[PDB]
Design a binder for these strands. Structure first.
Lengths: 153, 121, 202, 116, 49
RNA sequence: UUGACCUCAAAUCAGGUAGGAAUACCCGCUGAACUUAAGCAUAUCAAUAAGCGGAGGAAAAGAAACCAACCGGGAUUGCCUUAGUAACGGCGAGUGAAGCGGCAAAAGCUCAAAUUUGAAAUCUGGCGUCUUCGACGUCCGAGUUGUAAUUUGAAGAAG
RNA sequence: GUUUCAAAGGCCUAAUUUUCUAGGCCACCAUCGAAAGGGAAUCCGGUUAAUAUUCCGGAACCUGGAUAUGGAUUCUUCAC
RNA sequence: AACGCAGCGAAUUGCGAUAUGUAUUGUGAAUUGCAGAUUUUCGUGAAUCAUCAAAUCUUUGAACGCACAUUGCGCCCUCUGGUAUUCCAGGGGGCAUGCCUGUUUGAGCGUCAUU
């Protein structure tokens, strides 16, 4: 079909032409052995499933009526940061410790400038395969970026 | 990995699970009653001086029939109303734009006896 | 603040990074049809500045249109008239190629309502635009008060009459001494000042 | 001849017999019409056929409403007719539905009354 | 023309019935200014289709 | 071997929506010649008739990338003046606005671009129950490549 | 423009003996166009004020459905 | 737009096999060229009356199963007949195109993780 001939030839057309260095750096991806250890870490500090949020709000309503205590109750959550506009602000204020960028975003224009931003502020960053795999640890279809800030001792 | 073996050089549309209808509401609401009834098909008995000559001799009674009436439907209508077994039906459209059906009965039933029962003769 | 980086990056068009991406994308759009449905916006920063919102109701459409002048459709260059009107090849169309692109998608997708369009790419034979659309019949757009106004009956075919961004530019509706002959309405102003007003007592 | 208010109380089977009996009288009078100059009796009997068909159609359409009452989606003939333009246009819940920013604006500074 | 269609024959069926003179009892009606039928057709004089 | 994601399909899938009519007035495109110049070619008739697309009881326009050079006015629309004037034109025939001034009527406003990040707070449909132009509860989906609240330059935000 | 730089379908047998599921093969393609071209099968005699290869009497024939009687075939068999 | 419908109408005026109309409400005794009733005339009611909120609405037409100088030719579900899942007929309900939101089956080393 015509759609199959499109995507197979689009692979080839990018490779044959001389790609610039800004686009070329996304080929330098994280290897198989090191990557497995990273997602073992990031599946801890993952966000709440929809049922566990409903569990927490029932505990909130109980303590507020009989007790009256917000800000300390239902402890402090340690969780991975996600969303592009959300993550860029953390890197801009030197708060993010680790960053993980996807290699296959639809327009490259969206995510191309992040390597240059982390260079200036002195933030550790690493391009990694699968925007889907960043989505799996955060209850999403596709995540694009995923960064850490706070972590247990 | 390990590709699907395929002999032909063509690529056709793979047939899929085509699902049937299952609506949330009826479009019609009330089903309509019978458009063409027994009484509506056969309207009047023709009483021209030629028709009297056929009833006596030919064993055939004549009717004024409504348009949109098959020879299947006229055979069913005469059978239901007057309780008679029909032999054959022949139909024509008149010049004024009204259908006429010549109907011949079987040898058991006399056309003259049933004629005096219905009204005319 | 990710979108502001894209706002500045898009302006640097003659760079090495963008001239690569420009030539790869323009090939892809030729192989697809003239009018065809786009999954997501190509320029996400540019779309939301024209009132795009990622939810059920808003729709995007790519479109390709021819470059160059309009030709006078008389056969064999035979005008039948005075020497003033004998010109054929160097005549030009009064509406922009944005307006031509915005109208064609309106006739295909009749149920949708046109909001705005923006420039994607170009070559020698063609130009490319991405028209954004809104569905008025969908209940998300009807109930929400921010995007409710578009559902009203007065906004049926804004692209045709010229009530879009490109339409009001082409008509020449701006405040100034430069815009006298067309401002309120070109034909409206002519119809006013070419008229004899008579009262009961002269 | 037949009154309409009498046919309201009857069951489903009674109206069906009533209709078949009236059609036989109509058939017999059309035989009399060709063996006689004038016959105005034929007018009254075929008005009564229209009266019975009207009463039957009401009871069926009422029965369809009786079961469909309560829920969303019903037959298009049973929906409110009105006109095309009003039917596509916004409801009174819609349009009146104003944004959250101008809820606080209307409450804070509404049009106050004064004189002189 | 012998081998004619049903749509043609339906129009000619009307032409038979419409072509007839004015009934007498209409002329005795109140107000009434009608005397003879103006819309009348003969086959030799005027044609139909 | 199994399950995701991205693009593209199919179905008499669940539910919706678009066409034509009329056209006095209104918003655009397209576009003549007769005529006038005592001829005729730029001009004029005319940014008009015919042709094509699209609306409503009105339409369009509208809250300044304005008008001014004053002691400065203050969204748009129309009427009286400006004016047959400043300009245009084989500077021939002919064409031709706008500012201020006096009235009718007056009403103002919303997004994008900032992190809720100590809790996508938001929304379509399905199923159920009610006081049914809706409201309440629950189950999938949409969506972090950005849906709510918060702010629009007259300001405005964080302390 | 009408088979094209389209993912363009409808024809047969069981399975199952709820009547819904399984077998399969095969594949550049709407639809209108001739009452003088192509084309499944009806003749004689009678009868009306006006109709007939079309009604009546008598003798045939085709296409599509159903189906059981006779005959033929069968120790090596789908006749001699 | 065609074709029909009045006790006796060709046109005009009305309506659609419920056919110069039916139901609902109001007024309170007509209609009238000639018939004919109905007794409905101290009434849940005459009438070519006014009114109009429930229905009917042939064949068409933007016109929608495919066609249309044809009342041409098909396909699906469903009940009833003739011995019948497949053939014949009858009654009822359906099958256009573009586009949007979702649902279910899927296609592609376009591409990610796991044996």
């Amino acid at each position: 079909p015509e759609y199959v001939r499109l995507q197979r030839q689009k692979k080839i057309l990018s490779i044959r032409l001389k790609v610039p260095p800004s686009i070329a750096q996304f080929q330098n991806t994280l290897d198989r052995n090191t990557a497995a250890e990273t997602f073992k870490l990031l599946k801890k500090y993952s966000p709440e499933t929809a049922a566990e949020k409903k569990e927490r709000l029932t505990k909130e309503a109980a303590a507020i009526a009989e007790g009256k205590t917000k800000q300390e109750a239902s402890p402090k959550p340690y969780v991975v940061k996600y969303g592009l506009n959300h993550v860029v602000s953390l890197i801009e204020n030197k708060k993010a410790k680790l960053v993980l960028i996807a290699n296959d975003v639809d327009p490259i224009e969206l995510v191309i400038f992040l390597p240059a931003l982390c260079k200036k502020m002195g933030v550790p960053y690493a391009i990694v395969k699968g925007k889907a795999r960043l989505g799996t640890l955060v209850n999403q279809k596709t995540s694009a970026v995923a960064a850490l800030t706070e972590v247990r001792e | 990995k390990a590709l699907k073996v395929r002999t032909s050089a063509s690529f056709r549309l793979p047939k899929t699970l085509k699902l049937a209808r299952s609506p949330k509401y009826a479009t019609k609401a009330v089903p309509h009653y019978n458009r063409l009834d027994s009484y509506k098909v056969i309207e009047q008995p023709i009483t021209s001086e030629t028709a009297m000559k056929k009833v006596e001799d030919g064993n055939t009674l004549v009717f004024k029939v409504s348009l949109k009436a098959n020879k299947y439907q006229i055979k069913k209508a005469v059978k239901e109303l007057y309780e008679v077994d029909v032999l054959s039906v022949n139909t024509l459209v008149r010049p004024n734009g009204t259908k006429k059906a010549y109907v011949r009965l079987t040898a058991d039933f006399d056309a003259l006896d049933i004629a005096n029962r219905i009204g005319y003769i | 603040g990710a979108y502001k980086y894209l706002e500045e990056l898009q302006r640097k068009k003659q760079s090495d990074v963008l001239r690569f991406l420009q030539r790869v994308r323009v090939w892809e759009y030729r192989q697809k049809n003239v009018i065809h449905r786009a999954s997501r916006p190509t320029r996400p920063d540019k779309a939301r500045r024209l009132g795009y919102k990622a939810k059920q109701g808003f729709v995007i459409y790519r479109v390709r249109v021819r470059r160059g002048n309009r030709k006078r459709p008389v056969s064999k260059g035979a005008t039948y008239g005075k020497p003033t009107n004998q010109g054929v090849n160097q005549l030009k169309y009064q509406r922009s190629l944005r307006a031509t692109a915005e109208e064609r998608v309106g006739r295909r997708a009749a149920n949708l309502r046109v909001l705005n369009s923006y420039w994607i790419n170009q070559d020698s034979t063609y130009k490319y635009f991405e028209v954004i659309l809104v569905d008025p019949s969908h209940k998300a757009i009807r109930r929400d008060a921010k995007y409710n106004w578009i559902c009203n009956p007065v906004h049926k075919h804004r692209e045709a009459r010229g009530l879009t961004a490109t339409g009001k530019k082409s008509r020449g509706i701006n405040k100034g001494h430069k815009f006298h002959n067309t401002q309120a309405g070109r034909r409206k102003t002519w119809k006013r000042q070419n008229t004899l007003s008579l009262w009961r007592y002269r | 001849g037949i009154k309409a208010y009498e046919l309201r109380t009857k069951s489903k089977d009674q109206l069906e017999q009533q209709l078949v009996e009236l059609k036989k009288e109509l058939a017999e009078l059309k035989v009399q019409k060709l063996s006689r100059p004038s016959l105005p009796k034929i007018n009254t009997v075929r008005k009564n056929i229209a009266r019975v068909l009207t009463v039957i159609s009401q009871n069926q359409r009422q029965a369809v409403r009786e079961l469909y009452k309560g829920k969303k989606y019903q037959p298009k003939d049973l929906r409110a007719k009105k006109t095309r333009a009003l039917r596509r246009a916004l409801t009174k819940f819609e349009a009146s539905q104003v944004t959250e920013k101008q809820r606080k604006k209307q409450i804070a500074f509404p049009q106050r009354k004064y004189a002189i | 023309a012998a081998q004619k269609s049903f749509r043609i024959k339906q129009k000619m069926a009307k032409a038979k019935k419409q072509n007839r003179p004015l009934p007498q009892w209409i002329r005795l009606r109140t107000n009434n200014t009608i005397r003879y039928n103006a819309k009348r057709r003969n086959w030799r004089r005027t044609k139909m289709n």
